[PDB]
């Protein structure tokens, strides 16, 4: 949106006509050009031709663009006579300066030489120009310029009848804009390289001009034409571009020019006489100590061609259909051009962070997992809600305990695990509720009847996805409602009774199974909301996000992604999009109230990071909407903040666009044990509950009844009465009795488990004696009570004390289960081992520090250089000291961010606590400095 160079008309069908009538024809000069031959289609004019203008006008903007970064990170900027910059060039300012840019070279008839009459060309490609201004004056006088003595001034531009600047519109933007197009072809590319850059450093900065050249790389890629190297090492005899001379070094040094006082600039000529004596080489050249000081190139790095591909393949590339396509088509032509850009706006951001080692969606850790529980036991059983709190398993939980379910847990991933009976369980909570739910001063709803009248009116047959689609489409467009989910879910709500809270925190996973319906709603790349705020926060946020686009900039020599990953970790990351199922659109039409939002978020995941999935479906009308809950790991980085019309409320509207950016950096430290430990508590109280009720009931154990039957074993033997029985005793019961007891004095085992497991059962036994074999059944019993209690009572002792401090209690339960207990109090306690079992296998925690640990630990080493770097810069030197102090401040927030990272490299801050020292005296010193004057 706003104003730019692939968006607007007017300017693509000036380079339209340009091409059409001049840069498309052929070259009607006898000067050495002619037609190139590229895969069948002819291009006339390849050196100054459709891409070339076009490459113009692109670096024409993207020099605006960068000047303005260059302005917002500080920096003071070259003027010109009048205070103006070229950070303050006028959108309609740059129309016209592209527009004329269109003619800059149409005059040409042939390829100039060093012959002069270049000028006459000019004057040529003017009268192109006002040939079409004259063309239709009707649509483009009054309204892209003001007068003809305006396009009479551009006319003049073009002209060139003298190398003319100070003009901050045309003459820098069109001049540097077209020489520096010249990089592809000039001979010794590290002088020429070094003077544009220098150059265009003037009025620019060092950084922004880097960030300049690095796009221009880019888009010489994207017009498919040759990107030069760049060797710092050079031997090639240096040219001094500025004329046709070069330096001469003379015996023991370089001849430079006379003094005139004591340093003398160095001097050089064209080509001259040799006297024992050697021209300057690009190396030594570069080496000089001004240039190493004004030149970020002194780095050997740069490496011409493009990365891989090193073979013939590049020639054969740039020999290819797309030069001839770039050279022809205008508007592809230009949707290279901007692909190239906007990739250039996302690229170093990625180059900040760790790299997504694919993981689109986190998996559940304990604490969502014990949430997820406690939700389904809240939907399941609705009478543990109360006017307060929800009671559960002897468990208060309050308010707080809901919103630091919302803040912590991934409602998302929550809502993974929850079930289509806890949707249908959506039923009885809105039963059990008949209460109002307030809006952001209207009239309340009673949120149970509403949702309990949908259903049987609209929902007779009760079905479960239609309980999705109807809670979904509560979410899209019932305002009393969402403006309080989404309030609470955000933790920017006002007044809100507890049970608001208890149904937001609820619904946000159930309303996330959104994802259930329609999954293969394809993520569309781009998606549009709207936010009504106050010019102050709005302000703020314009600040802010602006922060963050200022010290992201194209790679080229210099580095810059410690400043980028610092401010961005900084300033808002956009958890105002976060946190709860938020509404957007791909249309710009909005959920609701179109005409009061002053600020619109314009959304970007061309990685399909957002996991968004569409409210309604493609039939019931053409719904271009989604719901998006942003995962942890995916962070809204803005690239562009722009103005835009206005709406009609008097408010002043802005767009900011973010793009999805997805890196461990992002994954948020949380606290363990906020939902999971009062989960435990709750089984902790069902088996001491347990254990009470067995305990009361259990009888004191009588140890006497297993010596007597052991007596009667070896009695037996010696009866001669049935030999069955002896056998049945000796060798069945025997050890049995022997197991059980030596396992029941003993600390609990599975000895004795397993003996309770061997047991004679009642399914045998009725075979033999009933006289007196009978009171033998009867002891035995008493000893499968004796054991069956043992056994169960002291693994739940072992398994509560195992549960005061988590997995090593999972385990104590598993031998008891099959045999013994009064019935349903075990299904209870089988019940508390199968929670303890979801967690204790469906937990996973993952990390901060991924496979670039390296990077980790250099962006590190980066950072804490960089920022002492400026901190002790700014311990050394009336009206500047004033923003350096803002400049203090700042530096104290960057040590922090660099403790908090040194925190999440290792899951010893020395250094840091050094940097904060200096911090505190350069405090000291600087507020006395500042009282001082």
Not at 505 to 532: E, I, W, Y
Not at 785 to 812: F, H, I, R, S, Y
């Amino acid at each position: 949106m706003g104003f730019s160079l692939y968006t607007d008309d007017t300017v693509k069908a000036a380079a339209q006509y340009a091409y059409d009538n001049y840069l498309g024809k052929p070259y009607t000069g006898s000067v050495e050009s002619a037609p190139a031959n590229f895969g069948g289609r002819m291009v006339y004019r390849q050196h100054h031709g459709l891409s070339h203008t076009l490459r113009t006008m692109a670096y024409a903007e993207l020099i605006v663009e960068e000047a303005r970064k260059a302005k917002l990170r500080g920096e003071t900027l070259g003027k010109f006579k009048d205070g103006r910059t070229i950070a303050d060039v006028t959108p309609q300012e740059l129309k016209k300066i592209m527009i004329a840019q269109a003619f800059f070279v149409a005059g040409r008839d042939d390829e100039a030489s060093d012959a002069k009459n270049y000028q006459k060309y000019h004057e040529q490609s003017r009268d192109a120009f006002l040939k079409y201004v004259k063309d239709n004056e009707s649509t483009l006088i009054p309204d892209v310029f003001k007068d003809q003595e305006d396009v009479n001034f551009y006319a003049r531009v073009i002209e060139d009848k003298s190398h003319d600047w100070e003009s901050t519109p045309a003459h820098v933007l069109i001049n540097q804009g077209h020489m520096v197009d010249l990089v592809r072809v000039k001979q010794p590319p590290e002088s020429f390289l070094q003077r544009y850059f220098s150059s265009m450093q003037r009025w620019i900065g060092s950084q922004a001009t880097e960030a300049v050249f690095g796009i221009q790389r880019q888009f010489f890629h994207a017009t498919y034409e040759v990107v030069a190297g760049f060797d710092s090492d050079n031997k090639e005899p240096h040219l001094v571009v500025s004329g046709l001379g070069r330096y001469v070094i003379g015996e023991d040094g370089q001849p430079i020019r006379e003094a005139p006082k004591g340093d003398l600039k160095v001097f050089p000529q064209t080509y001259k006489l040799k006297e024992n004596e050697r021209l300057m080489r690009v190396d030594e050249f570069l080496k000089l100590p001004e240039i190493q000081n004004t030149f970020p190139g002194s780095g050997k790095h740069l490496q011409g061609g493009m990365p891989g591909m090193n073979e013939m393949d590049y020639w054969n590339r740039l020999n290819s259909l797309n030069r001839a396509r770039c050279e022809n088509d205008v508007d592809f032509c230009l949707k290279q051009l901007q692909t190239a850009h906007d990739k250039a706006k996302i690229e170093p951001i990625k180059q900040a962070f760790q790299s997504s080692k694919g993981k689109e969606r986190r998996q559940p850790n304990v604490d969502e997992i014990a949430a997820a529980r406690i939700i389904q036991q809240i939907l399941a059983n609705p009478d543990c809600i109360h006017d307060d709190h929800v009671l559960i398993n002897g468990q208060k939980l309050e308010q707080q305990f809901f919103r630091d379910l919302l803040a912590k847990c991934e409602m998302a991933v929550v809502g993974s695990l929850l079930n289509d009976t806890d949707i249908g369980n959506i039923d009885t909570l809105m039963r059990h509720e008949k209460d109002t739910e307030f809006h952001s001063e209207a009239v309340p709803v009673k949120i149970g009847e509403y949702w309990i009248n949908d259903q049987r009116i609209n929902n007779s047959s009760g079905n479960i996805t239609q309980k999705k689609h109807d809670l979904i489409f509560l979410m899209q467009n019932d305002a009393w409602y969402f403006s309080r989910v989404n309030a609470i879910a955000q933790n920017r709500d006002k007044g809100s009774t507890f049970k608001e809270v208890l149904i937001t925190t609820l619904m946000t996973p159930l309303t996330s199974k959104a994802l259930v319906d329609t999954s293969q709603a394809k993520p569309p790349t781009r998606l549009f909301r709207g936010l009504n705020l106050s010019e102050e926060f709005t302000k703020g946020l314009i600040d802010q996000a602006n922060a963050m686009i200022a010290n992201t900039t194209e790679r080229l020599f210099t580095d810059h992604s410690p400043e980028a990953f610092k401010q961005i970790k900084l300033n808002d990351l956009s958890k105002m999009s976060g946190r709860t199922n938020a509404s957007t659109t791909t249309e710009i039409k909005l959920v609701k109230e179109t005409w009061d939002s002053n600020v619109i978020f314009e959304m970007l995941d061309p990685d399909g990071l957002l996991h968004s999935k569409q409210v309604g479906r493609h039939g019931e009308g053409t719904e271009s909407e989604f719901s998006v809950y942003l995962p942890e790991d995916v962070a809204l980085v803005p690239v562009k903040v722009t103005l835009d019309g206005k709406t009609q409320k008097g408010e002043n509207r802005y767009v900011f666009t973010f793009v999805a950016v997805k890196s461990p950096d992002f994954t948020p430290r949380h606290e363990s044990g906020y939902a999971v430990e009062p989960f435990l508590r709750m089984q902790a109280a069902k088996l001491a509950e347990v254990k009470s009720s067995i305990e009361k009931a259990q009888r004191a154990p009588d140890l006497e009844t297993i010596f007597n039957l052991q007596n009667e074993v070896e009695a037996v033997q010696y009866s001669h009465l049935s030999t069955g029985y002896k056998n049945f005793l000796k060798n069945t019961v025997g050890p049995v009795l022997e197991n059980s007891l030596s396992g029941l004095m003993e600390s609990d085992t599975d000895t004795l488990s397993k003996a309770l497991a061997a047991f004679p059962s009642d399914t045998q036994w009725s075979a033999f004696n009933f006289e007196e074999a009978r009171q033998a059944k009867r002891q035995m019993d008493a000893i499968k009570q004796m054991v069956g209690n043992k056994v169960v009572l002291d693994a739940l002792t072992q398994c509560q004390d195992a549960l005061e401090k988590g997995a090593l209690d999972a385990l104590k339960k598993i031998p008891s289960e099959k045999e013994m207990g009064t019935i349903r109090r075990e299904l209870r306690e089988q019940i508390q081992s199968a929670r303890q079992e979801l967690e204790s296998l469906q937990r996973a925690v993952v990390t901060p520090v991924v496979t670039d640990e390296k990077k980790v630990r250099e962006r590190y080493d980066a950072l804490i250089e960089n920022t002492s770097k400026k901190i002790t810069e700014l311990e050394t030197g009336l009206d500047a000291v004033k923003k350096g102090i803002s400049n203090l401040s700042n530096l104290k927030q960057e040590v922090t961010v660099l403790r908090n990272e040194k925190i999440r490299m290792h899951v010893f801050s020395d250094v840091e606590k050094l940097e904060q020292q200096i911090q505190v005296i350069d405090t000291k010193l600087a507020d006395a400095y500042l009282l001082e004057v």
